[PDB]
């Protein structure tokens, strides 16, 4: 009942920029390997044992923030269902430690080498410590993201990453078929060690606020060329399709002359011998037809891409100059290849866009063909292993190769222009990819509400390290975390990306900023005005207005605020050190404004919008959702009914809704070994508890999921289905296989409402409400479901001491949506008996006021720690690898909520 | 929209070159239709020079000018179409930029009046005010992102020195004509010299701006001395002489609106330097522009003449303040507003220089001396009252606010403890005390509660009076 307190250590994660994944048709390899060597561990730097775990983590979901979190904080690898760790004695996943057997078991100690193997084919994760196998594997987990090596640690550790190649020589041979992780570094990036989803970093003049990080997806490695099924080319284009192959054969042979190639019966890059390097006609026709398939695709692409191409000119094709190779830059045979002379041809800027898309599609077609042949990307080329450094989609390719492919396609475009063919650039159709979710796009930083100012003249600066979408200004204390700054009446900000001021909408103001530009935000609560200055010069509207906002009511007050978009970095200076301000003296000092934190011993505490979904009570004034508490009648139990307030009306909000009850049911610590009246002896000794959900007629059962969630469910997916549920299997065995334990872990044990509807012709909106019942046996860990009184096939098994919250995930399709029915069955106790100790022997159903419906909020306010762990990352050498070091301890006093199992 | 490089390319180029060439060929002409059309013709080529893509005053570097006919077109062509085969011969009667600047250079320092330079003022100067800014950004001293494209040499020879020489020269031409009766062209060079003031050098402040504004200050002081001379001796003849000061206040308001737009854009480009590092002359010029304002705040004629000038001559009074925002690629009182009036716009843009002189310890004296001025005391009554109340200045220990204000003030490079002499403090509070006193009379006119909407008898008796 009472809130619990304790001192815990801060834990930080460090990863290489190595991301691997599995997808249908992806260009990535499937098996990867890396090692971590422990150099120095202090077992007890503080009163709490030193944290150190090694494993793999998933990009979409593993976001451990400093401070509080699941359990008792200090979340690292294995503290969620997106990470899988190993600390020397246990396998960590879902914040549960499962002991694992290895020869000479011990917590990770200096001079220990941990080898982590990832096999995406199964999928499976396996470990070896000091060369001996660890008798335990993670398997059958989700694959909807990219995996990266990760180490989680508290202060007092010193480890080194061993990634193979020049980034750390392996102490042990990787198992056959597994690739070193250094081969997975992308062409456009160098290898490095970085934090994971940081909102803050050190800078020259002070801390830098960081927005969300742009992250790749496992589908970004799947080449997606334009469709070319419509094989219908104009007959005049068909004849030149073979001719286009002959010319392009000459240019890329001509470039081989610049590289030093000569003729040869053998075609080798190193030997610089080439049978094709004589002439377009002299080159063998079967060798010519090698590229006819691709050459035909080039002409087919403009038709596919929407470009209009036709026989504009025929006499131009008949008469054209021919550029010939110089006799000095000579190949062995003595003939001069004659590609078309095309100096007279010019391309419009719109045309220069088409070649870029043409080179894009040409690379993708080649990439997807190689994947079907078994090729995979690798930083180090391995021809026998079918590994290619260019086996990556076009946007991920480096500029050096990207420009080269562009030039070759440009000549092909020039060749069509040389013959005089009309090339019509299609009207470009813009599209928005939305790589990240709606909420992990803007991160809002504001001062603590205790710093709210209701009088005086105040000033602070905001340096734009980047030039993208960031807003800075003043906000009211009740600012919502999930609303863009200035979209409502709770903030007065200035958007320097395109020069706008935001308050209840946007209107032009000022000019866009540049890198290093400092915005001076001034508020005058005596005159009720807000002034923005850029580099000491007062910004003005499309008029003589020297003030951005006027006639602002003081009310509860104002707070400095800033929002950062993806990839955006900004510096916030509240003026604690008056000499640190760069434009305060130029504009603001003489006008009577003061720095916001002029006389304060400690730096101003800041709160940021944490995009980790949490369950919160449904607000009593929520515009769209209403929850009403039904009392128990003679024929009905107490209920919690949900209704859509604005269904059918304009502006109605229809989106996936994640609901749960505010109190859990805890399974017993130890499990047992191996008319319509309740029998008093049976009902007083049973451990089975029941609750049902009534899906009202009109609400589609296909949009309803009923079941339980563990206290670590933070998945606010708008396209939710049972395939999105986190899952993982932890399997233990003896010295030689012989699986003796295989536990299945998850956070969402639900059944789909669409499994309980007969495939009728129509009438899916039935006359009868669907009443899905849920049964839990706290003494055996077995959970069963009923459709309409008929037992369902699905069932679940859970470990002891598991907390389950009754939850329903629904997409509303009616004014009446669902109804939690807190009733009972024959010889089965209701939920109130399990939730409350005082009602353990009370078979009468109850709905006490503490029990209430909660909804999943995507964004919440979180307090930024005053101090952060100092982590030093460096490349120790070619053989030593990359070193991670953290020595100075940091401790925070955690407040633990027991029933929610979070701190 | 920078269409000069892509619109006037091959045969439009000769077309406007003929247009440019004939309009300026009006130099050797003195006719009445010429006289009235000079404002129309001056604005015509001024917008032409901003658009022409060829350095038509610098024929020696056209071989480096790709956006000209002589590079885009072959010598084989350009002969079927009538051309003199040389870019230097296209318009032989326009003196080169080095010559043209030198022509005006001796003209301004010679003290000539507008009558002998109507072409130079109405037409020659406006093109130079537009020619020179165009070739700054494409010539030397430009910030070139030319790592790949640094091969082509610059095709023009315009530097900051050329821009600054002309600006002071235009400043010199106005002060030579500072006192004549009629000059409707001052507002036209006021709007033409704005683009070139953006690259004035800090040496310009002392040499030109201080002497010119100082003469205006002593001009206004002499006239307001005549005005208060009239009002102290009331007579029916005071009207015959009220028009005299009205005429004198009209010529001053004409001269103020001839120079202040140049100061305003000058000050905006030099406040940052003046405050980070204190400047002696900048503090002097505040005392100069400040005394002019207190005249306008005190004299009633100065108020009306400033307003009469704006409405009759259609002074925007808004572009003079929004120029920086639009140059940097960014209803109520659009016709005229005191908030956007130039005289108070000059001081509000120049207040930080004056307030920077006073230490925060004098904050008590500022409120102290303002009270005497609100009690209608002269500049000598405050000085003696400030002298006897030197112990009322603030104490750093008694105010947490002053602890950091002092430290920031002492950290300024030009600050010396010897500057706190008893005569120096009383001067610097007295001068500002006059300024902030009259300024708050304007931002808060406090004329309300005197004549509020009263509807004495109109709403029911408007029919009778009509």
Swiss-Prot record, chain A:
Subcellular location, record wording: Sarcoplasmic reticulum membrane
Tissue: Detected in skeletal muscle (at protein level). Fast- or slow-twitch skeletal muscle.
Domain B30.2/SPRY: 1-168, 384-579, 675-827
Ranges for the Sequence repeats: 212-325, 326-439
Post-translational modification: The N-terminus is blocked.
General function of this protein: Cytosolic calcium-activated calcium channel that mediates the release of Ca(2+) from the sarcoplasmic reticulum into the cytosol and thereby plays a key role in triggering muscle contraction following depolarization of T-tubules. Repeated very high-level exercise increases the open probability of the channel and leads to Ca(2+) leaking into the cytoplasm. Can also mediate the release of Ca(2+) from intracellular stores in neurons, and may thereby promote prolonged Ca(2+) signaling in the brain. Required for normal embryonic development of muscle fibers and skeletal muscle.
Notes on the domains: The calcium release channel activity resides in the C-terminal region while the remaining part of the protein constitutes the 'foot' structure spanning the junctional gap between the sarcoplasmic reticulum (SR) and the T-tubule. Pore opening is mediated via the cytoplasmic calcium-binding domains that mediate a small rotation of the channel-forming transmembrane regions that then leads to channel opening.
Subunit-structure text: Homotetramer. Can also form heterotetramers with RYR2. Identified in a complex composed of RYR1, PDE4D, PKA, FKBP1A and protein phosphatase 1 (PP1). Repeated very high-level exercise decreases interaction with PDE4D and protein phosphatase 1 (PP1). Interacts with CALM; CALM with bound calcium inhibits the RYR1 channel activity. Interacts with S100A1. Interacts with FKBP1A; this stabilizes the closed conformation of the channel. Interacts with CACNA1S; interaction with CACNA1S is important for activation of the RYR1 channel. Interacts with CACNB1.
Miscellaneous comment in the UniProt entry for this protein: Binding of [3H]ryanodine indicates that the heterozygous channel is activated by Ca(2+) concentrations 4-fold lower than normal. Single-cell analysis of cotransfected cells shows a significantly increased resting cytoplasmic Ca(2+) level and a significantly reduced luminal Ca(2+) level.
Protein name as catalogued: Ryanodine receptor 1
Source species: Oryctolagus cuniculus
Section covered of the full-length record: 631 to 1647 of 5037
């Amino acid at each position: 009942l009472l809130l619990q307190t304790n001192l815990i250590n801060y834990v930080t994660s460090i990863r290489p920029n190595i991301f691997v994944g599995r997808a249908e048709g992806s260009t990535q390899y499937g098996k990867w390997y890396f090692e971590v060597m422990v150099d120095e561990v202090v077992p007890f730097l503080t009163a709490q044992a030193t944290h150190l775990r090694v494993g793999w983590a998933l990009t979409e979901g593993y976001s451990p923030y400093p401070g509080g979190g699941e359990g008792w904080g200090g979340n690292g690898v294995g503290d969620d269902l997106y990470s899988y760790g190993f600390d020397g004695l246990h396998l960590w996943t879902g914040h549960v430690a499962r002991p694992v057997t290895s020869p000479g078991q011990h917590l990770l100690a200096p001079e220990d080498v941990v080898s982590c193997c990832l096999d995406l084919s199964v999928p499976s994760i396996s470990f070896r410590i000091n060369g001996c196998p660890v008798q335990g594997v993670f398997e059958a987990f989700n694959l909807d993201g990219l995996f990266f090596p990760v180490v989680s640690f508290s202060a007092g550790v010193k480890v080194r990453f061993l990634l193979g190649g020049r980034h750390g020589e392996f102490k042990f041979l990787p198992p056959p078929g597994y690739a070193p992780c250094h081969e997975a570094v992308l062409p456009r990036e160098r290898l490095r060690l970085e934090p994971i989803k940081e909102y803050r970093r050190e800078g020259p003049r002070g801390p830098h606020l960081v927005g969300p990080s742009r992250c790749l997806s496992h589908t970004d490695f799947v080449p997606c060329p334009v469709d070319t099924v419509q094989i219908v080319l104009p007959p005049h284009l068909e004849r030149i399709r073979e001719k286009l192959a002959e010319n392009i054969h000459e240019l890329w042979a001509l470039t081989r002359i610049e590289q030093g190639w000569t003729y040869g019966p053998v075609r080798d890059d190193n030997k610089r011998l080439h049978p094709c390097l004589v002439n377009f006609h002299s080159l063998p026709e079967p060798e010519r037809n090698y590229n006819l398939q691709m050459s035909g695709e080039t002409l087919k692409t403009l038709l596919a891409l929407g470009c209009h191409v036709g026989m504009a000119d025929e006499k131009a094709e008949d008469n054209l100059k021919k550029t010939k190779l110089p006799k000095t830059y000579m190949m062995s045979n003595g003939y001069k290849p004659a590609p078309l002379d095309l100096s007279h041809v010019r391309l419009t800027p719109a045309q220069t866009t088409l070649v870029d898309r043409l080179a894009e599609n040409g690379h993708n077609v080649w990439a997807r063909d190689r994947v079907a042949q078994g090729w995979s990307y690798s930083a180090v080329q391995d021809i026998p292993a079918r590994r290619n450094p260019r086996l990556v989609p076009y946007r991920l390719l480096d500029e050096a190769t990207k420009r080269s492919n562009r030039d070759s396609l440009c000549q092909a475009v020039r060749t069509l222009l040389g013959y005089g063919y009309n090339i019509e650039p299609p009207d470009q159709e813009p599209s928005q990819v939305e790589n990240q979710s709606r909420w992990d796009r803007v991160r809002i930083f504001r001062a603590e509400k205790s710093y709210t100012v209701q009088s005086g003249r105040w000033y602070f600066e905001f340096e734009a390290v980047t030039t993208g979408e960031m807003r800075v200004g003043w906000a009211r204390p009740e600012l919502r975390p999930d609303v863009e700054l200035g979209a409502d009446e709770l903030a007065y900000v200035f958007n320097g990306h395109r020069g706008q001021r935001w308050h209840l909408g946007s209107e032009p103001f000022g000019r866009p900023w540049q890198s290093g530009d400092v915005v001076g935000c001034m508020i005058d609560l005596t005159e009720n005005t807000i002034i923005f200055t850029l580099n000491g010069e007062v910004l003005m509207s499309d008029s003589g207005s020297e003030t951005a906002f006027r006639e602002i009511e003081i009310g509860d007050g104002f707070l400095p605020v800033c929002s950062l978009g993806p990839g955006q970095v900004g510096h916030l200076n509240l003026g604690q050190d008056v000499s640190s301000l760069r434009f305060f003296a130029i504009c603001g000092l003489q006008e009577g404004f003061e720095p916001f934190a002029i006389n304060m011993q400690r730096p101003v505490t800041t709160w940021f919008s944490k995009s980790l979904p949490q369950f919160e009570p449904v607000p009593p004034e929520h515009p769209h959702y209403e929850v009403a508490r039904m009392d128990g009648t003679v024929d009905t139990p107490p209920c919690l009914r949900l209704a859509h307030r604005t269904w059918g009306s304009q502006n109605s909000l229809v989106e996936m809704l994640f609901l749960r009850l505010s109190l859990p049911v805890q399974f017993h610590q130890h499990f047992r070994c191996t008319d319509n009246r309740d029998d008093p002896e049976i009902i007083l000794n049973t451990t089975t508890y029941y609750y049902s959900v009534r899906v009202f007629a009109g609400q589609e059962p296909s949009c309803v999921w009923v079941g339980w969630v563990t206290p670590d469910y933070h998945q606010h997916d708008m396209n939710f289905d049972l395939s999105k549920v986190r899952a993982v299997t932890v399997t233990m065995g003896d010295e030689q296989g012989n699986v003796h334990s295989s536990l299945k872990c998850s956070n969402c044990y639900m059944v789909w409402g669409g499994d309980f509807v007969s495939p009728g012709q129509q009438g899916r909106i039935s006359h009868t409400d669907l009443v899905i019942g849920c049964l839990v046996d706290l003494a055996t860990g077995l959970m069963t479901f009923t459709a309409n009184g008929k037992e369902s096939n699905t069932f679940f098994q859970v470990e002891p001491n598991t907390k389950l919250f009754p939850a329903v995930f629904v997409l509303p399709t009616h004014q009446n949506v669902i109804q939690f029915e807190l009733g009972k069955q024959k010889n089965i106790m209701p939920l109130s008996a399990a939730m409350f100790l005082s009602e353990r022997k009370n078979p009468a159903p109850q709905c006490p006021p503490r029990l209430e419906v909660q909804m999943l909020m995507p964004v919440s306010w979180s307090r930024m720690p005053n101090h952060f762990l100092q982590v030093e990352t460096r490349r120790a050498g070619e053989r030593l690898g990359w070193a991670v070091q953290c020595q100075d301890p940091l401790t925070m006093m955690a407040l633990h909520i027991p029933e929610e199992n979070r701190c | 929209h920078q269409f000069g490089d892509d619109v006037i390319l091959d045969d439009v180029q000769v077309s406007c070159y003929r247009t440019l060439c004939s309009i300026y060929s009006l130099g050797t002409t003195k006719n009445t239709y010429v006289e009235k059309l000079r404002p129309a013709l001056g604005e015509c080529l001024a917008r032409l020079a901003a658009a022409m893509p060829v350095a038509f005053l610098e024929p020696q570097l056209n071989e480096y000018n790709a956006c000209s006919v002589y590079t885009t077109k072959s010598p084989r062509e350009r002969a079927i179409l009538g051309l003199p085969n040389s870019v230097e011969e296209m318009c032989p009667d326009i003196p080169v930029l080095d010559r043209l600047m030198a022509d005006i250079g001796g003209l301004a320092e010679s003290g000539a009046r507008y009558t002998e330079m109507p072409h130079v003022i109405e037409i020659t100067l406006p093109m130079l005010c537009s020619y020179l800014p165009r070739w700054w950004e494409r010539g030397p001293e430009a910030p070139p992102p030319a790592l790949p494209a640094g091969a082509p040499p610059p095709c023009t020879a315009v530097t900051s020195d050329h821009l600054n020489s002309l600006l002071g020269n235009i400043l010199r031409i106005i002060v030579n004509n500072l006192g004549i009766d009629e000059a409707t062209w001052m507002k036209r060079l006021a709007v033409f010299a704005q683009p070139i003031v953006s690259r004035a050098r800090p040496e310009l402040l002392h040499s030109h701006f201080i002497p010119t504004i100082g003469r205006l200050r002593k001009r206004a002081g002499k006239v307001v001395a005549e005005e208060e001379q009239l009002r102290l001796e009331a007579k029916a003849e005071a009207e015959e002489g009220e028009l005299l000061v009205r005429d004198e206040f009209s010529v001053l308001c004409r001269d103020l609106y001839a120079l202040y737009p140049l100061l305003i854009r000058y000050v905006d480009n030099n406040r940052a330097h003046w405050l980070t590092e204190p400047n002696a002359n900048a503090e002097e010029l505040f005392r100069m522009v400040g005394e002019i304002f207190i005249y306008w705040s005190k004299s009633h004629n100065f108020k009306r003449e400033e307003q009469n000038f704006v409405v009759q001559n259609e002074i925007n009074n808004m572009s003079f303040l929004t120029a920086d925002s639009k140059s940097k690629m960014a209803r109520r009182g659009d016709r005229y507003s005191v908030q956007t009036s130039l005289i108070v716009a000059t001081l509000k843009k120049m207040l930080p220089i004056g307030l920077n002189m006073c230490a925060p310890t004098d904050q008590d004296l500022i409120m102290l001396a303002k009270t005497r001025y609100a009690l209608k005391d002269t500049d000598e009554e405050v000085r003696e009252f400030l002298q006897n109340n030197l112990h009322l200045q603030g104490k750093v220990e008694g105010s947490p606010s002053l602890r950091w204000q002092m430290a920031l003030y002492r950290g300024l490079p030009g600050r010396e403890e010897d500057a706190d002499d008893p005569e120096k403090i009383v001067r610097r509070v007295q001068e500002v005390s006059a300024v902030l006193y009259h300024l708050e009379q304007t931002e808060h006119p406090y004329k309300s509660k005197k004549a509020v909407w009263h509807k004495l008898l109109s709403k029911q008796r408007r029919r009778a009076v009509v």
